[PDB]
Amino acid sequence: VQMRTTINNESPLLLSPLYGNDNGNGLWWGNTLKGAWEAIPEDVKPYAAIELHPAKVCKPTSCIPRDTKELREWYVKMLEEAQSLNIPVFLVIMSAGERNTVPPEWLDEQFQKYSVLKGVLNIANYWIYNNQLAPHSAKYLEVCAKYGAHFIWHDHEKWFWETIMNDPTFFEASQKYHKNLVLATKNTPIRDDAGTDSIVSGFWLSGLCDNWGSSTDTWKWWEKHYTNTFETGRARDMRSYASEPESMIAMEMMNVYTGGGTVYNFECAAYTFMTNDVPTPAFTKGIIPFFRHAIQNPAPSKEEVVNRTKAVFWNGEGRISSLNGFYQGLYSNDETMPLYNNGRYHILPVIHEKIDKEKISSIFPNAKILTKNSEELSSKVNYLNSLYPKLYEGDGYAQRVGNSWYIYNSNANINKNQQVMLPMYTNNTKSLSLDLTPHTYAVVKENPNNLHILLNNYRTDKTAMWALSGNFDASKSWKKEELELANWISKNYSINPVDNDFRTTTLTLKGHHKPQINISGDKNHYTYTENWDENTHVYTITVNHNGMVEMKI
Numbered sequence: 001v002q003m004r005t006t007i008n009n010e011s012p013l014l015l016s017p018l019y020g021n022d023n024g025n026g027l028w029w030g031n032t033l034k035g036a037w038e039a040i041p042e043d044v045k046p047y048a049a050i051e052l053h054p055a056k057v058c059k060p061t062s063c064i065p066r067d068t069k070e071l072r073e074w075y076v077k078m079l080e081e082a083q084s085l086n087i088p089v090f091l092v093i094m095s096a097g098e099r100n101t102v103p104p105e106w107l108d109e110q111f112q113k114y115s116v117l118k119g120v121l122n123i124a125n126y127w128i129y130n131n132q133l134a135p136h137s138a139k140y141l142e143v144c145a146k147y148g149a150h151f152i153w154h155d156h157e158k159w160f161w162e163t164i165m166n167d168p169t170f171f172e173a174s175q176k177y178h179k180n181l182v183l184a185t186k187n188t189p190i191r192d193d194a195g196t197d198s199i200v201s202g203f204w205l206s207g208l209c210d211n212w213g214s215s216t217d218t219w220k221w222w223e224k225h226y227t228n229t230f231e232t233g234r235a236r237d238m239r240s241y242a243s244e245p246e247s248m249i250a251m252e253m254m255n256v257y258t259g260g261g262t263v264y265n266f267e268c269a270a271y272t273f274m275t276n277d278v279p280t281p282a283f284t285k286g287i288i289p290f291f292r293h294a295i296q297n298p299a300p301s302k303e304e305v306v307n308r309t310k311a312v313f314w315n316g317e318g319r320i321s322s323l324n325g326f327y328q329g330l331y332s333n334d335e336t337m338p339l340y341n342n343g344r345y346h347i348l349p350v351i352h353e354k355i356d357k358e359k360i361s362s363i364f365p366n367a368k369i370l371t372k373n374s375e376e377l378s379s380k381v382n383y384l385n386s387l388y389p390k391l392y393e394g395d396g397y398a399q400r401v402g403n404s405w406y407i408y409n410s411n412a413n414i415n416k417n418q419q420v421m422l423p424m425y426t427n428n429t430k431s432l433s434l435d436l437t438p439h440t441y442a443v444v445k446e447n448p449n450n451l452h453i454l455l456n457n458y459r460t461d462k463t464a465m466w467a468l469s470g471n472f473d474a475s476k477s478w479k480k481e482e483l484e485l486a487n488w489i490s491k492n493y494s495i496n497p498v499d500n501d502f503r504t505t506t507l508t509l510k511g512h513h514k515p516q517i518n519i520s521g522d523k524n525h526y527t528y529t530e531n532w533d534e535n536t537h538v539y540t541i542t543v544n545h546n547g548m549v550e551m552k553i
């Protein structure tokens with residue numbers, strides 16, 4: 001049987017979601033299925049699909065997909081529409097602990113009838129676990145395998161993912177149907193961000209799923225009580241989901257990309273995608289440009305991630321969920337938030353207890369296997385620092401990935417610059433330094449005879465949205481105040497983005513022949529000054545921008 005979707009490092013997947021309305025044309029936020037697909041640029045379409053979440057169609061509770069006549073109707077309606085239009089779709093069929101979801105038999109028939117049906121999703125259960133979720137997912141996975149489809153599970157937290165793969169049924173099914181399984185994060189609940197990345201990517205490395213990825217959720221900004229960028233002392237509301245910086249969304253994608261991840265999904269869609277069929281700047285200027293990077297430059301393969309791995313942590317003698325300060329002093333000071341401070345260790349993989357130590361030895365023959373009882377954990381940093389050499393100076397985030405540097409400012413909501421000094425691996429230049437404002441990422445690729453630099457610091461000013469009168473409390477989600485916000489978005493944010501405030505990225509090449517540069521970027525959204533020191537051979541470019549800037553040097 002041929003797969004319905006090709007998903008790997010050379011062929012990643014972007015999911016863009018649609019939400020059921022129990023009313024009207026059947027979809028929330030003024031969106032249409034046709035409008036959704038039209039929003040996907042043509043070069044992205046071969047690597048994209050639409051998620052169909054029943055949402056308000058679910059009864060008694062919105063977004064909890066209990067099997068009803070009305071739910072099945074809605075799935076069928078949307079499938080019908082998707083087919084006539086040839087739009088690849090995935091259905092959210094599991095969510096929030098629901099034990100009584102659509103029968104496996106029914107899904108099986110939908111697969112027979114619709115070649116646009118590429119697979120299904122289980123999303124968000126960490127707060128409402130029961131022992132039927134893993135077995136039910138296993139059964140659904142088995143149906144997906146029968147039809148060359150994918151089962152995609154977005155969930156979070158260390159104890160939860162440990163618990164899921166400890167299930168006999170799900171563990172046996174993952175071992176058989178890994179080709180059809182995508183395990184994926186969902187950092188909504190502002191806990192365990194590092195641990196989750198380790199365990200989930202760890203599953204992919206252990207052969208339990210052929211692909212991993214993420215749901216990058218801007219609701220986390222609301223969970224933190226954050227409001228306007230850098231603002232404190234204001235009450236949160238739904239505008240908080242519309243306030244995580246655009247480029248930061250891309251930085252969260254970068255965490256996945258550089259860890260070998262391959263599937264990208266997002267909430268809240270009113271911010272991250274589209275309202276009234278008008279794509280947002282977060283989508284077009286945040287998510288799209290980074291997904292395009294992932295298309296043009298395949299993510300680290302499984303063998304690449306394995307071969308760079310100097311140590312793994314194995315849950316076989318005590319679990320990472322019982323080590324609450326493990327990532328401190330390594331690469332995350334704050335597991336409530338997604339950004340990593342250090343790229344020195346990549347994502348350290350965590351291997352689930354169900355994987356024998358001997359199997360770990362054969363996946364990572366040159367890796368050190370750490371456990372909770374490891375003597376070396378009395379000097380955790382010093383020990384890991386003797387296996388993973390220091391690669392750069394400064395306080396910013398940088399990771400070496402093959403012949404590339406992946407860089408960002410790691411301050412989520414604090415207006416402070418970070419600097420990195422990057423030794424280089426070719427004689428194009430001796431070192432490269434960056435000064436970076438918050439919400440700026442960079443990719444430096446060393447070719448044999450040139451360097452390619454991508455910069456993106458796109459962040460709209462959210463002040464105008466925050467200045468609006470009205471009630472936008474989260475208790476009004478799925479209600480008309482949410483639509484008011486969604487309408488405002490399509491007339492203000494999405495069409496007149498307040499993105500004319502530039503910020504400075506400073507790029508210095510030391511020991512670089514006077515560089516002739518080729519430069520481009522987002523139209524009307526950058527200026528630059530060059531400076532060359534004849535005697536010291538230092539070349540400095542000062543880029544003022546709000547958006548993407550690309551150079552070849």
Ligand SMILES: CC(=O)N[C@@H]1[C@@H](O[C@@H]2O[C@@H](C)[C@@H](O)[C@@H](O)[C@@H]2O)[C@H](O[C@@H]2O[C@H](CO)[C@H](O)[C@H](O)[C@H]2O[C@@H]2O[C@@H](C)[C@@H](O)[C@@H](O)[C@@H]2O)[C@@H](CO)O[C@H]1O
Binds near residue numbers: 096127219220267477
């Ligand atoms: C009972 C409870 O309070 N649960 C919340 C989750 O949110 C609520 O429960 C859901 C079943 C929905 O009815 C939702 O409308 C409701 O708020 C919550 O999940 C998400 O959290 C964000 C806030 O951080 C939003 O509320 C968002 O709409 C929720 O996500 C939806 O529901 C999920 C179950 C999935 O289906 C998503 O894909 C949906 O978009 C979590 C977050 O930690 O917290 C629970 O306590």
